[PDB]
UniProtKB/TrEMBL annotation, chain B:
Gene that encodes the chain: tcdB
Source taxon at top rank: Bacteria
Compartments it resides in: Host cell membrane; Host cytoplasm, Host cytosol; Host endosome membrane; Secreted
Upper lineage: Bacteria, Bacillati, Bacillota, Clostridia, Peptostreptococcales
UniProt protein name: Glycosylating toxin TcdB
Family membership: Belongs to the clostridial glucosylating toxin (LCGT) family.
Binding site for Mg(2+): 286, 288, 516
Segment of the intact protein contained: 1 to 541 of 2367
Length: 179, 541
């Protein structure tokens, strides 16, 4: 008698090498292996329980910095919500997430689309290039949750994806007619 | 006995004071048929469950608010479980073929040495090394045109070397524009020459093209063709051009699209291996795969605390076997050498005590499988088509063929007419992106987003389209197809919970090999930046 499971399309975006695949694979299957990137099937799905409500999550990882707007647009049509990933040891990857935020709002046509910001590779604190305060200020200024995560140690991996489901649910409830 | 009988379903979907509708009796009749198909093939029982499922959907669609729908939806679940009971209960012998593929160029000594480990401990298996005798020069054409395109791009960076603009992204993007112009120049040359003289084989057109346009010597080329043809025939060579079921099949043109036009040998090999399973049956293996290590070989050596994944532990053991037995010369030991003295000596001790290679690598022996299924390897818990098992003509092998046809129909129908208007890379890509957006819907948008990088495959970082068109994704498609009684599913959303039913047994393979970490078709951001500094350092210093 409980409501049928919701299905959510989540897109993990950010520069190439920031750890989108590593985060996604850790979230789905709890595997991480350094120096081992097999060309596995990339259509990641998982049944999830968030605040005691199950949801089916289809997760789509983007490829690299995509140059062509038409191609980047197809990735953004696909997302009901976005995991916006940079690596804390790579200010250039942090620079890229500011750009992707603009595009997401432009393509969904909102000020407040479900987005969770992730500074990945928290294990590499000794090589930090973006201060935690500067990243979490970028989060607070756009009303998106910020998690410092490590796919390598499986730190905040479940927490960040679960928070993105919360933001999607809350946004979709607010969007019910009349808006 | 597994699935409910007619009387069980009748009480499950019982509604008081409701007529037995014709569409409802049709389900009961079909389910009664199914329980008396003692004598039929596994495939005929599956097709019957397909009918039952299809009649159940017809009922639910006709009486959308019927009190029977809750029980019929639970009956539908029971049909899916019964697929798996049918799969598990009726096994057939797997043909004793080990199939490998090396196409587009001369087979390397490293490929041979891996294949020999399989051959040595599976003397009851026929070994095939599938190659294409018409197409030994594709790897030389690709390498030449990439080298030419790199040279042009590095020269155009003459005196902007230390600007921030001229980084690895700027290089690969402008080199890709030049590659596209060059690749199309060849493709239009191949298309024109084939049309005019259909007796020309691929290498006849490629060597003429390399001597004309890139001043290569036709005699080194002809000697290379001769060297390459003699090496594969000495090592179980099985010529694709003698594969008649393949050549006259539905997907041979797609195989040649990847081989001749895309210079994607991994993509061509993805397609050929499906035809191999469908028409011949056996075990398929990528040439970077090694036999399963004998589970009793290292039972007495505890994994050190330093080694934190199963992949790292397998890699240690493979390296240990190769350092002390030297079965594969030049096989790295960089990981094994970091282990403690005591552990290294323990490996040496155990390996010195073994004489028979079959005590190191586990012989496959007799394998049996459902006539429905293709089994597939798992890596980090996701499927990867680097290892497959199928009896000849399996139901899934046919679903895989339909997966390839549909995916290339969407791709070729969409990108082809855009390529044909003869604009450069950037114009072609933007138009392709707009054409893809125009056909996208919720069902296919994941696929649509993953095929935009098609023209970049092999030439640009993170161009992974091959996974989606011909590789692991088609197997997620075919398994979804089988478990939903559908065909050509383009939304490949499926849980590992379902895919684990089709897993290639981990005991019959070692995936954590040296060659598996060096992909021959794609490369990541880090590799691109490493390439860029070496490209520059070589061009100048
Ligand atoms: N130390 C560390 N390395 C990571 C982490 N996540 C990913 N990496 C590494 O960064 C590289 C790129 O990761 P990948 O998942 O392919 O990033 P993508 O290009 O965004 O998909 C790989 O070598 C990963 O092992 C992390 O949390 N910590
Ligand atoms: O020049 C080539 C490159 C690749 N392949 C085929 O493509 C397969 C896949 O190559 P690889 O293992 O690099 O792909 P990955 O597993 O990295 O996706 C090989 O085993 C071969 O069958 C080939 O025949 N010739
Ligand atoms: O491992 C076998 C591989 O062949 C090629 O690489 C394909 O891109 C991929 O589908 C698969 O991973
Ligand atoms: Mg990736
Ligand atoms: Mn491989
Ligand atoms: N029955
Ligand atoms: N039917
Ligand atoms: N493994
Ligand atoms: N099979």
């Amino acid at each position: 008698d409980p409501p049928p499971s919701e299905t959510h399309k989540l897109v993990v975006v950010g520069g190439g090498g920031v750890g989108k695949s590593a985060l996604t694979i850790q979230f789905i299957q709890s595997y991480f292996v350094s120096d081992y990137d097999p060309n596995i099937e990339d259509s990641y799905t998982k049944i999830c329980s968030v605040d005691g409500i199950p949801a089916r999550l289809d997760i789509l990882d983007t490829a690299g910095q995509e140059e062509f707007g038409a191609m980047r647009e197809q990735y953004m049509r696909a997302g009901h919500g976005f995991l916006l990933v940079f690596a804390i040891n790579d200010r250039q990857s942090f620079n890229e997430v500011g750009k992707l935020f603009t595009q997401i709002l432009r393509v969904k046509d909102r000020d407040d689309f479900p987005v969770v910001l992730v500074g990945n590779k928290a294990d590499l604190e000794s090589q930090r290039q973006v201060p935690r305060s500067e990243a979490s200020a970028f989060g607070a200024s756009h009303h998106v949750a910020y998690f410092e995560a490590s796919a390598k140690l499986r730190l905040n991996v479940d927490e960040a994806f679960e928070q993105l489901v919360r933001a999607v649910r809350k946004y979709q409830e607010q969007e019910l007619p009349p808006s | 006995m597994s699935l409910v009988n007619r009387k069980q379903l009748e009480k499950m979907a019982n509604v008081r004071f409701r007529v037995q509708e014709d569409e409802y009796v049709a389900i009961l009749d079909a389910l009664e048929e199914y329980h008396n198909m003692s004598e039929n093939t596994v495939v005929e029982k599956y097709l019957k469950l397909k009918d039952i499922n299809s009649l159940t959907d017809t009922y639910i669609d006709t009486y959308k608010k019927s009190g029977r729908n809750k029980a019929l939806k639970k009956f539908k679940e029971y049909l899916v479980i019964e697929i798996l009971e049918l799969k598990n209960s009726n096994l057939t012998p797997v043909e004793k073929n080990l199939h490998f593929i090396w196409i587009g160029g001369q087979i390397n000594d490293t490929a041979i040495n891996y294949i020999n480990q399989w051959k040595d401990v599976n003397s009851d298996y026929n070994v095939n090394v599938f190659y294409d005798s018409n197409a030994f020069l594709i790897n030389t054409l690709k390498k030449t045109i990439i080298e030419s395109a790199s040279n042009d791009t590095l020269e155009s960076f003459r005196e902007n070397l230390n600007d921030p603009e001229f980084n690895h992204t700027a290089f690969f993007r402008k080199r890709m524009q030049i590659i596209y112009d060059k690749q199309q120049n060849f493709i239009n040359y191949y298309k024109a020459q084939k049309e005019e003289n259909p007796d020309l084989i691929i290498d006849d057109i490629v060597k003429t093209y390399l001597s004309n346009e890139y001043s290569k010597d036709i005699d080194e080329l002809n000697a290379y063709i001769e060297e390459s043809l003699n090496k594969v025939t000495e090592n179980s060579g099985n010529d694709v051009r003698n594969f008649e079921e393949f050549k006259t099949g539905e997907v041979f043109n797609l195989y040649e699209q990847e081989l001749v036009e895309r210079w994607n040998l991994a993509g061509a090999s993805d397609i050929l291996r499906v035809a191999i399973l469908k028409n011949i049956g056996g075990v398929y293996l990528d040439v970077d795969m090694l036999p399963g290590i004998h589970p009793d070989l290292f039972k007495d050596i505890n994994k050190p605390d330093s080694v934190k994944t199963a992949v790292d532990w397998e890699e240690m053991q493979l390296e240990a076997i190769m350092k002390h037995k030297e079965y594969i010369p030049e096989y790295t030991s960089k990981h094994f050498d970091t282990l403690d003295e005591e552990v290294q000596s323990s490996f040496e001790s155990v390996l010195a005590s073994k004489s028979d290679k079959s005590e190191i690598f586990l012989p496959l022996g007799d394998i049996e499988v459902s006539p429905l299924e293709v089994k597939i390897a798992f890596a980090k818990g996701s499927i990867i088509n680097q290892a497959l098992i199928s009896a000849k003509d399996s139901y899934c092998s046919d679903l895989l063929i339909k997966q390839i046809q549909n995916r290339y129909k969407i791709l070729n129908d969409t990108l082809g007419p855009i390529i044909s208007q003869g604009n450069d890379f950037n114009t072609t890509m933007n138009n392709f992106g707009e054409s893809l957006g125009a056909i996208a819907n919720e069902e296919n948008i994941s696929f649509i987003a993953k095929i935009g990088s098609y023209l970049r495959v092999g030439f640009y970082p993170e161009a992974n389209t091959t996974i989606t068109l011909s590789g692991p994704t088609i197997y997620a498609g075919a398994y979804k197809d089988l478990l939903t009684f559908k065909e050509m599913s383009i939304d490949t959303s499926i849980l590992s919970s379902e895919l684990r039913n089709f897993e290639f047994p981990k005991v019959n393979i070692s995936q954590a090999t040296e060659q598996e970490k060096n992909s021959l078709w794609q490369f990541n951001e880090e590799r691109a930046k490493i390439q860029f500094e070496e490209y520059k350092k070589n061009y100048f210093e």
